[PDB]
Amino acid sequence: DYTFNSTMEQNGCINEAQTWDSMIEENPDIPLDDVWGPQNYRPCFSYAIGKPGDLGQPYEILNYSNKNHIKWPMTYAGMYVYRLKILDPNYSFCNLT
Amino acid sequence: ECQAYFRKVIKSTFFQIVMITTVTTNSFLLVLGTNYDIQFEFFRTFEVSELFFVSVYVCEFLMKVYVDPITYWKDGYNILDVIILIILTIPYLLRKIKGNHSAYLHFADGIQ
Amino acid sequence: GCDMTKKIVVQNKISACTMGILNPVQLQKNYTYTIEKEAYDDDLIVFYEYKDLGCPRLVYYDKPWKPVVELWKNGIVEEIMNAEYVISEINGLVTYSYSLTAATANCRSQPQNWSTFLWNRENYVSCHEDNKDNPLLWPNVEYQVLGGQTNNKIIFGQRNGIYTFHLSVVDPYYSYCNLNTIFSVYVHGALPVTKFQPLLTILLMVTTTLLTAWLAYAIPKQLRS
Numbered sequence: 521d522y523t524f525n526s527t528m529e530q531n532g533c534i535n536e537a538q539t540w541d542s543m544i545e546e547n548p549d550i551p552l553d554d555v556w557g558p559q560n561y562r563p564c565f566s567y568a569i570g571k572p573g574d575l576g577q578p579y580e581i582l583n584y585s586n587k588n589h590i591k592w593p594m595t596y597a598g599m600y601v602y603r604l605k606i607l608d609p610n611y612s613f614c615n616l617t
Numbered sequence: 618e619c620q621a622y623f624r625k626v627i628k629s630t631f632f633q634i635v636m637i638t639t640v641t642t643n644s645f646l647l648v649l650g651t652n653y654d655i656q657f658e659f660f661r662t663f664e665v666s667e668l669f670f671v672s673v674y675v676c677e678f679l680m681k682v683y684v685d686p687i688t689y690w691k692d693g694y695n696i697l698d699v700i701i702l703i704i705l706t707i708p709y710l711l712r713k714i715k716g717n718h719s720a721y722l723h724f725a726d727g728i729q
Numbered sequence: 730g731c732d733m734t735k736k737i738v739v740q741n742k743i744s745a746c747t748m749g750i751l752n753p754v755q756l757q758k759n760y761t762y763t764i765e766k767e768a769y770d771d772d773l774i775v776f777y778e779y780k781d782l783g784c785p786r787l788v789y790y791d792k793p794w795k796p797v798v799e800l801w802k803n804g805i806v807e808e809i810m811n812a813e814y815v816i817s818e819i820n821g822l823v824t825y826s827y828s829l830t831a832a833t834a835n836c837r838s839q840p841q842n843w844s845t846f847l848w849n850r851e852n853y854v855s856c857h858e859d860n861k862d863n864p865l866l867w868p869n870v871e872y873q874v875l876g877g878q879t880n881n882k883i884i885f886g887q888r889n890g891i892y893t894f895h896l897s898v899v900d901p902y903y904s905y906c907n908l909n910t911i912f913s914v915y916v917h918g919a920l921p922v923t924k925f926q927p928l929l930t931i932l933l934m935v936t937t938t939l940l941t942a943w944l945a946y947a948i949p950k951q952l953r954s
């Protein structure tokens with residue numbers, strides 16, 4: 521139960537992106553740290569790579585120059601200890617979390 | 618001679634019921650014709666029904682081609698319906714089988 | 730010589746997808762379409778590729794249409810393309826006519842058509858010069874060249890299917906680069922005709938004869954009463 525600012529579209533994603541739930545579905549048994557990262561990243565603004573899927577699901581590749589804020593359900597109160605990880609495959613040589 | 622029997626037949630409610638049924642099926646054809654699928658596909662029913670309708674309207678004009686146009690030239694509703702038949706028959710005669718020089722389509726739903 | 734950074738693109742401002750005919754989410758998985766025996770002589774079929782083409786353009790039957798092509802340098806729009814260009818079919822269909830046939834285009838040197846053999850910047854000699862030994866054998870032979878100073882377009886047929894236009898820029902004074910592209914269009918007409926030799930007048934005469942036969946049958950009904 522957590523969502524964000526926007527969807528596939530209104531961010532420029534021409535073709536289908538890759539979201540967190542789909543990627544947790546992608547990897548059956550290995551923990552999350554080896555699920556998604558800079559070794560696996562494929563951009564959405566591609567028009568040739570992965571998928572012409574339906575657009576409008578929540579978009580979690582959030583970055584600057586993008587407004588993408590975080591959102592949680594209003595009703596119940598809780599905490600979600602988020603660890604932030606950088607996804608760009610040619611930004612730096614090391615891991616930054 | 619047989620004009621009395623013909624006028625008796627034209628006074629019968631069954632012929633008018635058949636006419637009303639045919640033109641109500643024409644109304645349903647127009648209802649399905651404003652769509653795009655039945656406009657040109659799954660349209661053999663459209664073809665045969667339209668042939669039936671134009672046959673019926675030609676028959677109606679044959680009933681109204683009598684000497685009664687001595688009353689279909691001064692009256693009210695009567696001139697309206699025969700003129701409606703004329704402005705029906707001429708365009709689709711030059712539209713369904715056109716083969717002519719004309720600009721485009723703007724009188725299909727109008728004719729219906 | 731040539732400038733390899735230049736390319737030609739066809740605008741796809743509104744495409745046939747994202748409306749009530751076809752969706753982008755499906756076409757990539759072998760969305761094969763039909764040909765109704767009009768290309769050369771049978772069971773020809775066509776295989777669209779979404780990745781290579783995209784969502785095809787959408788036009789209507791009996792609409793004078795011209796593609797508008799833009800020039801791109803380093804991935805940037807810079808200028809629309811106004812030179813003379815020609816189109817052809819890779820599959821080889823003939824169910825599309827052309828506009829005004831070169832006499833109202835004020836041609837004077839017997840233009841060549843898609844029958845001399847591919848066109849390029851090399852083979853093409855125009856007909857708007859004043860060459861002195863082929864003025865005409867031509868009342869109304871068409872003018873298979875779009876663009877330029879002339880204003881001829883392509884009048885579409887009633888096939889209601891996808892078309893793959895192979896476009897070649899044909900002017901030999903624009904650039905040395907043999908500009909060429911492939912794009913896709915789709916037509917959505919009004920009505921196919923299966924009337925055959927029975928005419929409206931023929932069926933009208935048949936109905937009049939049948940109704941007169943019915944009247945001749947109903948005359949004894951009054952006679953017997």
Ligand SMILES: *[C@@H]1O[C@H](CO)[C@@H](O[C@@H]2O[C@H](CO)[C@@H](O[C@@H]3O[C@H](CO[C@@H]4O[C@H](CO)[C@@H](O)[C@H](O)[C@@H]4O)[C@@H](O)[C@H](O[C@@H]4O[C@H](CO)[C@@H](O)[C@H](O)[C@@H]4O)[C@@H]3O)[C@H](O)[C@H]2NC(C)=O)[C@H](O)[C@H]1NC(C)=O
Pocket residue numbers: 530531532534565566567568583584585586738
């Ligand atoms: C931070 O996050 C933001 C968004 O959240 C990112 O901004 C996005 O950056 C993308 C690229 O860096 C932009 O992607 C688009 O890609 C299209 C490529 O499509 C081509 O199409 C031709 C057709 O002939 C093909 O041959 C090619 O192979 C490609 O497939 C471009 O067309 C597109 O250019 C324009 O985009 C605007 C939208 O702003 C359209 O309105 C316009 O019509 C045109 O298509 C663009 O390059 C993406 O638009 C952009 N999004 C936003 C909202 O800015 C940042 O990149 C992220 N930060 C970092 C550092 O990565």
Ligand SMILES: *[C@@H]1O[C@H](CO)[C@@H](O[C@@H]2O[C@H](CO)[C@@H](O[C@@H]3O[C@H](CO)[C@@H](O)[C@H](O)[C@@H]3O)[C@H](O)[C@H]2NC(C)=O)[C@H](O)[C@H]1NC(C)=O
Pocket residue numbers: 839840841842844866867868870871
């Ligand atoms: C493509 O262009 C060539 C010209 O290089 C066209 O050939 C010429 O076409 C005209 C018009 O059809 C011919 O003139 C007439 O031919 C008919 C016979 O079809 C004849 O009865 C008339 O009296 C008159 O001569 C002309 O002869 C012909 N030239 C040659 C050398 O064949 C060709 O028709 C064009 N094709 C298309 C598809 O546009």
Ligand SMILES: *[C@@H]1O[C@H](CO)[C@@H](O[C@@H]2O[C@H](CO)[C@@H](O)[C@H](O)[C@H]2NC(C)=O)[C@H](O)[C@H]1NC(C)=O
Pocket residue numbers: 525526530587588589
């Ligand atoms: C996501 O929610 C935020 C609210 O925090 C919206 O952010 C605004 O974005 C506009 C667009 O430039 C700015 O002018 C505002 O200053 C922003 N306000 C705040 C509080 O951040 C953003 O519009 C939302 N995204 C979408 C797609 O609706």
Ligand SMILES: *[C@@H]1O[C@H](CO)[C@@H](O)[C@H](O)[C@H]1NC(C)=O
Pocket residue numbers: 758759
């Ligand atoms: C469609 O083509 C692709 C690639 O050519 C192939 O993998 C797929 O099996 C084909 N599907 C059908 C139904 O022919």
